[PDB]
Amino acid sequence: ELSISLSLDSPKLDESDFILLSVKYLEKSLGKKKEFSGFFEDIEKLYFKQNYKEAIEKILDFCKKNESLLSEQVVQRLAEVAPRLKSNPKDNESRRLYETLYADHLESVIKQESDLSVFNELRDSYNAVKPEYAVTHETEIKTLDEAKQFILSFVMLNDNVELPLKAQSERYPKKDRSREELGNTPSANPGIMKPNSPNFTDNLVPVRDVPKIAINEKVAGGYSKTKPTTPFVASLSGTTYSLMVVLTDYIEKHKTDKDIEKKVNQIINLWISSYIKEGYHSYSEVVDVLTEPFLQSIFDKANIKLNYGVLDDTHAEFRKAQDYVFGLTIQSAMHHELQERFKNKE
Amino acid sequence: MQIFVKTLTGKTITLEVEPSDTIENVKAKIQDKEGIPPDQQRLIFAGKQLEDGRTLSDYNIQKESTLHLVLRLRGG
Amino acid sequence: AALVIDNGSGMCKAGFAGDDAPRAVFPSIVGRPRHQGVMVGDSYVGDEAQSKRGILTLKYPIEHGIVTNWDDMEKIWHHTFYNELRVAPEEHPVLLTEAPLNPKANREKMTQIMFETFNTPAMYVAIQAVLSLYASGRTTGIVMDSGDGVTHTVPIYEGYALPHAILRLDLAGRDLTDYLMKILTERGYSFTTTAEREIVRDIKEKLCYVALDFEQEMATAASSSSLEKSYELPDGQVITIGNERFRCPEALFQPSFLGMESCGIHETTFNSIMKCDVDIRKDLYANTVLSGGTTMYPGIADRMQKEITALAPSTMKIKIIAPPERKYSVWIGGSILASLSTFQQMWISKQEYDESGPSIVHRKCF
Ligand SMILES: Nc1ncnc2c1ncn2[C@@H]1O[C@H](COP(=O)(O)OP(=O)(O)OC[C@H]2O[C@H](O)[C@H](O)[C@@H]2O)[C@@H](O)[C@H]1O
Ligand SMILES: Nc1ncnc2c1ncn2[C@@H]1O[C@H](COP(=O)(O)OP(=O)(O)NP(=O)(O)O)[C@@H](O)[C@H]1O
């Protein structure tokens, strides 16, 4: 496949695009060998975790221990592009699509697993903590979309009840969402994909208005500067603090339950799926709120070990992001040759 | 007509309005009386954040009705 | 040796990758004869359905840009391959063009039919307005494509037609030919019959143009013969054409002329540009590429420069790009793409289709 060497030309290749383009190359050449089953199985989880540095190292080492089975110009070109790779929060399109797909799979997995009984049990934690202006939730939750309507209304607790928690945080003050009001722009793209970014035709959604948020770059130690791998949608989420208030009431009211980690995991995971699907936030814009130690304490002291959406297999979405990256980078080379053909008509 | 905008302090702002006044309009009056930037303003009625492009007639917001104000906070 | 086929509302432009022009241009028409009996001795495509349309019953499956009947689309396609191009399609990879805003289910029948019915080795689907931009050597800007049954304002950012801003007006050449028929029958000439339609469509492509200020051209037509031209009918009569010359294309800017409350192509371009990010708009305002036969009117690009400037801000740089070749812009952009070496890795192959089916086109051509 010479295609991989034409994709590697793109000036805008990022670390995500690399992992996806390198792994797809390796899996065609040396493929189905179950000896190598491990290597890709572990890279797929490393990409998900957003541990690109580690994966890059592994990927080049694969071509170090396995050079004989792979094409030399490709192995050496990958090695060359690698030292210079960067990630930019404003533009992380392969990962934007990946996570938008991942949260479809995370919604199916919550759907197979949950009977929605925790979302009915979590009603009375909501109604307990809500501000008086927040609307008492009286309905029974029989479908995942009512748990989803319900879950998301915790945003009403914002700016008020979540503040005592919000103040303990070292991370949140390093948020960098520009205070500019930019309004809403139209979009047909789903999730955390950007409106003007290319997409598959099976993957379009009904056109709607989507909010425009600007990054504040003048922030020292700003989050998009610390974790550039994470796509910017709205910086650090503070509605996580509100779910934290609601959830803390649940842990108290249900401390004796033996299925509490499973149930709290279902709630946490549906939140992640939901914020990604609605375009509110990226995964690490939520998880990176939850995992701050002081909040980890709430779970740990109650013996709740959260999986934060880590699923068994991320393959279908890994392979679909690979096709997208491929087709965009060949289109960049397609565009490059084209304009360099039109430069010669003078 | 009339309305009362309550704060998280429980203090009561009284803003005289006419039912076609937009939510954009009421936040401006609020700033004029209290100085609060209109962009930190979130007005709730019947449990729903009021969109500033609609009107009080569109929310069935009427005379002697109370709205809730919650100031947004982005310092970090 | 790749093939390129523009599947358009009125007519199809077909030819080979590397050629500056399509080799075949013929109506999108399938005659199915009104009675059996003309079948003794069983459909009709393009021009031959045109001549025999008395005996036949004519369907336009691409009317409005989106393929409507596939049984008739296959015929048009078979006709294109074996008769107009005189080519075995199992020989030549086939790049095909689609309308803006085409439903995902349609793009699969094109893919499926090309591989299953005609057994092509490889294939690609491309948006008509994106290839027009490509013939002008741009990747970013807003395409105004006006054809026979459909007009489209399509903003393209870096190769990507923006679905949230793509605007459709069903007003184009067919309607301008009908309206000209009406204008000229108000002046006493008689155009009703479809042959009389066919003559009127000649007068449009020659004599008609776009006024810069419609009022001043009106006032000049009422003040002198300068703008009148004559025309020689088939049968030898010479009829004179006045302000009908620019009142025909004026229906593009003023659709009220045919009784349609729509917005004019300028307002449509402004409205399409306004539905994009403020951040990309200078770039659309600086690259508005005109495309398709209904843009060929003399003076269309200046009027649009006048009207978008009147609509856009005072500070906006406004460039209308109206390339002399824009009639076949879609096809020529087709042929350029097909001839690139990079594009040799972009084809969907037969191996791939079998491995996937018609859904391969969503991940390949996007
Ligand atoms: N007018 C609104 N109506 C309903 N929901 C709203 C509204 N505005 C925001 N949200 C909800 O906000 C959620 C997505 O959160 P995100 O904006 O990504 O960043 P965060 O989590 O750190 O803070 C949210 C703040 O955004 C504003 O500052 C509000 O004042 C909030 O205080 C969604 O559930 C929305 O439904
Ligand atoms: N010089 C010309 N001046 C004015 N109108 C013309 C001229 N040439 C062709 N036309 C008209 O342009 C219209 C569109 O032709 P065409 O551009 O092939 O549209 P289409 O087949 O529907 N698809 P598309 O290629 O996407 O525009 C035809 O209906 C003609 O009547």
TrEMBL record, chain C:
GO terms for molecular function: ATP binding; identical protein binding; profilin binding; structural constituent of cytoskeleton; ubiquitin protein ligase binding. Coiled coil: none annotated. It is found in: Cytoplasm, Cytoskeleton. One of its GO terms (biological process) is sarcomere organization. It comes from the Eukaryota. ATP binds at S9, G10, M11, K13, D148, K204, E205, G293, K327. Keywords: ATP-binding, Cytoplasm, Cytoskeleton, Nucleotide-binding, Oxidation. One of its GO terms (cellular component) is filamentous actin. Its main location: cytoplasm. Belongs to the actin family. This is Actin gamma 1. The lineage of its organism: Eukaryota, Metazoa, Chordata, Craniata, Vertebrata.
